[PDB]
Amino acid sequence: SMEVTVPATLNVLNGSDARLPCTFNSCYTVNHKQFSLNWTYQECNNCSEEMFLQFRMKIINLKLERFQDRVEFSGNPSKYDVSVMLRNVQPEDEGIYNCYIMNPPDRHRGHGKIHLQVLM
Amino acid sequence: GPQSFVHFTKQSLALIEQRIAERKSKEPKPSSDLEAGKQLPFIYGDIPPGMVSEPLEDLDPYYADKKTFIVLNKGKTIFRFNATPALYMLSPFSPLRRISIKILVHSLFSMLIMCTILTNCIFMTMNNPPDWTKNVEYTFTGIYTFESLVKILARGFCVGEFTFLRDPWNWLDFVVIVFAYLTEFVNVSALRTFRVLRALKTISVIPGLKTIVGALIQSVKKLSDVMILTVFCLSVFALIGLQLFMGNLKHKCFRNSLENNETLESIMNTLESEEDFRKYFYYLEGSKDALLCGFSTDSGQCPEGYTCVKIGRNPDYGYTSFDTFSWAFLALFRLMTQDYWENLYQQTLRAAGKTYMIFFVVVIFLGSFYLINLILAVVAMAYEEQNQANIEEAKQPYWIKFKKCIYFIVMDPFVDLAITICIVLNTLFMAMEHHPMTEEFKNVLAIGNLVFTGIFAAEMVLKLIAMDPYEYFQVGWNIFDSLIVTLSLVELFLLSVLRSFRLLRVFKLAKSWPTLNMLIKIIGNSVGALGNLTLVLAIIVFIFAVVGMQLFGKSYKECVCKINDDCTLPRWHMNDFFHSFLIVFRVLCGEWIETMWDCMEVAGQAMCLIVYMMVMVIGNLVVLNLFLALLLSSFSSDNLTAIEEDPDANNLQIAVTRIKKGINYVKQTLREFILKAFGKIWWNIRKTCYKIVEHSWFESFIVLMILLSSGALAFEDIYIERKKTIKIILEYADKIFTYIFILEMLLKWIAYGYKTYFTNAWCWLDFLIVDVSLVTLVANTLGYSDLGPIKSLRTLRALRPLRALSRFEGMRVVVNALIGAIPSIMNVLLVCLIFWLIFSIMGVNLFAGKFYECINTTDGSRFPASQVPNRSECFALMNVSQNVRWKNLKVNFDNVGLGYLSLLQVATFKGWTIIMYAAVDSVNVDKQPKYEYSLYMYIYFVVFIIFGSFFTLNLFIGVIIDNFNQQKKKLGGQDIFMTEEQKKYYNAMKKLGSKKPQKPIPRPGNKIQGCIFDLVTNQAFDISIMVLICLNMVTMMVEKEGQSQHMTEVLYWINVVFIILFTGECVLKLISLRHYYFTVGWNIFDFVVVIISIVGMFLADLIETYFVSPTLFRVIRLARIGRILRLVKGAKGIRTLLFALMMSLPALFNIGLLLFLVMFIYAIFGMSNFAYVKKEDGINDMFNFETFGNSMICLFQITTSAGWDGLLAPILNSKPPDCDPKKVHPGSSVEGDCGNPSVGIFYFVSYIIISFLVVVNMYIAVILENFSVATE
Amino acid sequence: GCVEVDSETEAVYGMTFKILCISCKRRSETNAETFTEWTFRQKGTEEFVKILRYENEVLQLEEDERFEGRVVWNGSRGTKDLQDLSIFITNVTYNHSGDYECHVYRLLFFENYEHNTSVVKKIHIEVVDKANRDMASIVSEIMMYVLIVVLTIWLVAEMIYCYKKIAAATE
Ligand SMILES: CC(C)CCC[C@@H](C)[C@H]1CC[C@H]2[C@@H]3CC=C4C[C@@H](OC(=O)CCC(=O)O)CC[C@]4(C)[C@H]3CC[C@]12C
Ligand SMILES: CC(C)CCC[C@@H](C)[C@H]1CC[C@H]2[C@@H]3CC=C4C[C@@H](OC(=O)CCC(=O)O)CC[C@]4(C)[C@H]3CC[C@]12C
Ligand SMILES: *[C@@H]1O[C@H](CO)[C@@H](O[C@@H]2O[C@H](CO)[C@@H](O)[C@H](O)[C@H]2NC(C)=O)[C@H](O)[C@H]1NC(C)=O
Ligand SMILES: CCCCN1CCCC[C@H]1C(=O)Nc1c(C)cccc1C
Ligand SMILES: *[C@@H]1O[C@H](CO)[C@@H](O)[C@H](O)[C@H]1NC(C)=O
Ligand SMILES: *[C@@H]1O[C@H](CO)[C@@H](O)[C@H](O)[C@H]1NC(C)=O
């Protein structure tokens, strides 16, 4: 698969800002008209994926009810960075975080899995 | 002392230490025969059983004082070590120490290490190792650690003098081990790259490779001056090209009509795609780059609605430009190596104009050929010394009667001749195989092959029963023939390759052929006396291939879409080992620029540049060293053949002798049996006409008429109908010249007589030309002007310039040299044809009828193999759809002649890639090719390049240079390429470079002029001026395309300051050296150079201010190159080679005059023949045979054989739908748009052969002779 | 390939005459759809009246007593890209003397581009009763015999002169 550098497990104290890093490596130059980004969240291994962040020629956020307005971005496609923020993380936010990356002309699709753990 | 073998003991160590203490209290070279690593002299005799592989006392008296002990193995080798305690832990007498030397000296240890290294290389070949290779890597690391640690225990690490670290190969081993241990503990392509350094240990392990590597190092050391001169010439030519063609390759045709208020600047920003650029710039069909244009009349033209503009990127991913000094240097190095140089030639001509071909002519002749020949001369001279030094030191019952009868049958002058004739008949018979066959032809071929193999097996069995098998397997030819017989029987019992193995029996003719034996000597010398050099070459190629794979395979696989529109791997890549090896081999053949472009696109500029330059330099050095080594070991050995010529009375000769004995016995009896059964005025006229013909005025008039007639020939192009007056004038001048030449012929007839006129070859040539002219004139007068071969006879008017051959003495002497070399040239050409016949027959057996394919003719793309697998399907597509063709490859292996053409294309590396792609894609007859289905057919082409290209080129050069040397020595030691008058100038201008002493410019009497004179004569002044010249050169290199306005002014002022300083130096040299400054030629050169510098600066200022002329401004500004040409003064290495070039200049002028005459004749022929062929492949709107200039450009391009396949390709098609035999061609009465395959093939093959014989051979032999002269 | 050869300016009464009009494309590999229009201004007349028009492989002939049945197509055939716009006159008359204009309308086809060009060629026809012989051939043919005679005279003069010198030494 694509070179996607993903931390295995992320633990962040409850009630604090959590930086969730997702990054990749590929040939070519980043094209805004072509970049496709999946941002999925799951409450468990078998839980259904939920889309919260998106990139269709720009940054598009779906404003999920379970996340309210706590989801933010700190990446720019040029530096191969697509990391996302969760301000004021909650115990409900514990689960599985995933970032699929699709950067044409590269036909391979990235896949980076993070299991977020929230401490007391 | 034959009995000097004493065990090393503590008493011996104490005695050595005591002597050292005596020497130290009182305060020569080692014997070569006893030095470590070689064999002990035979004078010592056999080693005692208790002395071998044991610590023994030193034998060299020089080492007797110091503490050194010796160990000798059973292989009779001298190993020297240090008696000091290794690491101050173990003594030489230590128990484990003794075992350490015992296992260190064994040859089994060396065998084990070699096996481990070979297995390591084999595993290095893999690109995706499986999971279980980790254990094998651990085993290799452990074996290497064990091998190194044994050496550490015996000889010590660093403290002594015969220790581990003192050997550089041990340095390499230690670096390998530490870099292998570092990775596993630390725990990417760079890291696995270091693994190739294990393969470099083969040089140390395998005996004899160290000496070869050392000799290669010395050969490199002898190329310092040539390398410096090459760098200087490349830099000067790159500066010239940067001044001339800066930004010219950015010319594009931008559309005139723009919508939505768009502009060039507006549209240039939002364009990142190939299609978007296609929408605004003109592209040719299936082209990756926008079409180049120019602002001149002789440049390329834009389609209606487009205008030329300098914008965008340069062609070939932007890597081809003269924008910066570095890109210009890359372009000039590419020109010097002549790698794809015709593409740059055509691009530059299209962008700048056809008048700029003079730059390419100068670069190719003065720079490319000359520097390469200099490199060859220097390397060959270095190898000659090395070889001289090497040889100089070396010099210092009933069945018994049955087999007796069979032995009587073996009687040679008939049976051996019969077998030779059968071999010749068999190889002729197998050459009749071709793809389109009837069944009866195939059956008769099979029957003939079966009969021939039966005859050969019968002769084998007859010899085996005549002479017993014990000494039957003694002659190499006999075991060879048994091998062929066994292989043929095995093939009969059971691929396509196996059938052609019997072709090797053609080599049996070497016993009588003295040149086939030369070829076999060259071939066997590579794996014999020069086997170590070939092994080093193979190891180097393997290392380069593995390095390329490990460095760029993943980059190729993951960055595919940057170098391929289909996002798939290209034809040439470094993903796996086989393709990386193919790329390395292609680089060794001289083709590196395009694969380097792909590498730089997928993996970065710096890494690919470094790797490709290293591969080029090292591999070219090794290949060329092997080439000269073979050429000198096989050819220069023609000084003494101790054995007599064919001790068996020349077995074939007795066959001829026995036959002519019967012929003489028959001829004498046949004649006998028939006889038994049965005046003053005439000689005055002769003398007067003799006086007329040899008069100088008559000769000058005839020469002028010849030149005028050739110039008139050069006028009949496709545009002759646009100029009616010139056409009429030429038609009447034709009759005038015919009258003049008929009169000249009659005068020479009356003034020489029939005997002398018709015993002269030049007179015969002139007579034949005038007869063809007279027949043409008679046919034109009588009205029989357009029937039968009369147009073809008119076409032969292009041979008229041959009349100038006998009127210029330089061309006459070059033609005489060619004629003298003709016999050996024909002999070696016949040998090379015989050798290439085997390869052509093999290619016919492999690739007959397998190059056909469905193609979608709209884009020329082959249909997949999922749909239309095979031919019936192509016809189905022909009805199912349109623009579908079942198309062959024009040049293929369909028959032996087409195979010869394909092998000529492969040997010259021109058009070979298409043939290789077709061959590796081949599946079967009437089957659609699959991409790299027969991938390992590349091996066929590799073997052919090794044998039919490398070895045949070796034989060609050797024999031709031998013939030239024989011609030179026959005349008494004079150059065979220079006229009698040229020799006097040669002697005088050779003496011009030998006057060592001169009067030392007496100092002026007065004060200030003396006080600046002594400043002039100081060497520090000259060094400072040289440094200033180098700085001016640098300021020239820093220029680039679109730099700035501030940078332009700064550079202009820096150049002005440099000009002022140089003029001041010249003037201050004139204040001193009163009128003595003009004595030295170099001072005259400096004075003239500063004059041109000042004049050019002022003229460029005037042109830029008061005038408008960019091209002429650039040409004028090119004059500042003269300032940096003064760098030659302070260089003895460069001056000597340039003196050799000036030595060779006259012979080069004569050879170039002959070459230009041949080019003129071929240009007239091409204008006559190929002026209307279809514009495809190498012939386009700019490079064709329509006018004289275009034909001259094409012929200059193919003089180096560059792109002759592209020029030949559209002439090969002669039938629909490949052409239109009824094309209209508005403005002319000619119909049809395709050429004659026979005429075109003869034209191009003959021209490339003549160019190879003339330019390459002569340039080398004249450069070689002048280099020898100037190196004394 | 294509060469723009100018038309001959002299026509012979009663004979057949071809008026050349060749307009080659700047680049020969480009695709175009071309049609032509011819206008003729007779001598003594001011306006350039139209005579014919050729488009889509069919020649449309206008009303003209001077060209009612004496004009046939002599240009490119079997194509829409016409680089040869020449016409043929099957019976030359005194009314054919004048100035001809050959209007060429070429429509180039490109990737996303369509360019509409126009080329006008002017041809002057002078009808004569007898075909005059060109002055280029008159001088050239005379220059042949002048050079042939002078060169022969030069050779014979030296040959005769050399005989006197050589024969003198014999005696
Ligand atoms: C023919 C004889 C003289 C042996 C020639 C051996 C060379 C072909 C080998 C030996 C060591 C090799 C080098 C060993 C290590 C490196 C570092 C390596 O570094 C990287 O890859 C880092 C940068 C990057 O790729 O991101 C690049 C290749 C290079 C220079 C190798 C280039 C090829 C070398 C010079
Ligand atoms: C291999 C097949 C395709 C047949 C090719 C034609 C052969 C029948 C001809 C071509 C070249 C010929 C050879 C050309 C030259 C020689 C050398 C000649 O001997 C010498 O000239 C000896 C000179 C010396 O001893 O100094 C004996 C015949 C031989 C072998 C000829 C034998 C017949 C050959 C092989
Ligand atoms: C030529 O190509 C076809 C492509 O499959 C070969 O196979 C036959 O194709 C036809 C048409 O698609 C099918 O109807 C047949 O059933 C296929 N044959 C078989 C064995 O199933 C065809 O055999 C090829 N012709 C030859 C002579 O090899
Ligand atoms: C022996 C001096 C020649 C040295 N040197 C010159 C340069 C090319 C290689 C070598 C060379 O020519 N050898 C050579 C010999 C020796 C005889 C006949 C044919 C050839 C090619
Ligand atoms: C996000 O999700 C889709 C799957 O629903 C995936 O194909 C792609 O990576 C993203 N969207 C698109 C259409 O690019
Ligand atoms: C110039 O550009 C504007 C858009 O920026 C456009 O609306 C306007 O019509 C254009 N005018 C011309 C001169 O084409």
Numbering used by the authors:
A (entry chain C): 29 to 148
B (entry chain A): 8 to 34, 47 to 206, 210 to 418, 728 to 825, 831 to 1014, 1175 to 1768
C (entry chain B): 20 to 190
Kindly provide excerpts from the paper associated with this entry.
Therefore, BPV, LCM, and CBZ occupy the same site beneath the intracellular gate, which we name as site BIG. Instead of wedging through the gate, these densities block it from the intracellular side. BPV is primarily surrounded by hydrophobic residues, including Leu964, Leu967, Leu968, and Phe971 from S6II, Ile1457 from S6III, and Ile1756 and Leu1760 from S6IV. The 3,5-dimethylphenyl and the piperidine rings of BPV, linked by an amide group, align on a similar plane against the BIG site, leaving the butyl tail pointing to the cytoplasmic side. The purchased BPV is a racemate of dextro-(R)- and levo-(S)-bupivacaine. The aromatic ring and the piperidine basic nitrogen of these two isomers largely overlap in site BIG. The primary difference in the binding poses of the isomers is the opposite orientations of the butyl tail. Therefore, both racemic isomers of BPV can be recognized at site BIG. In the presence of the drugs BPV, LCM, or CBZ, the three S6 segments other than S6I all slightly move toward the center in addition to the α→π transition of S6IV. Consequently, four gating residues, Leu398, Leu964, Ile1457, and Ile1756, move closer to tighten the gate.
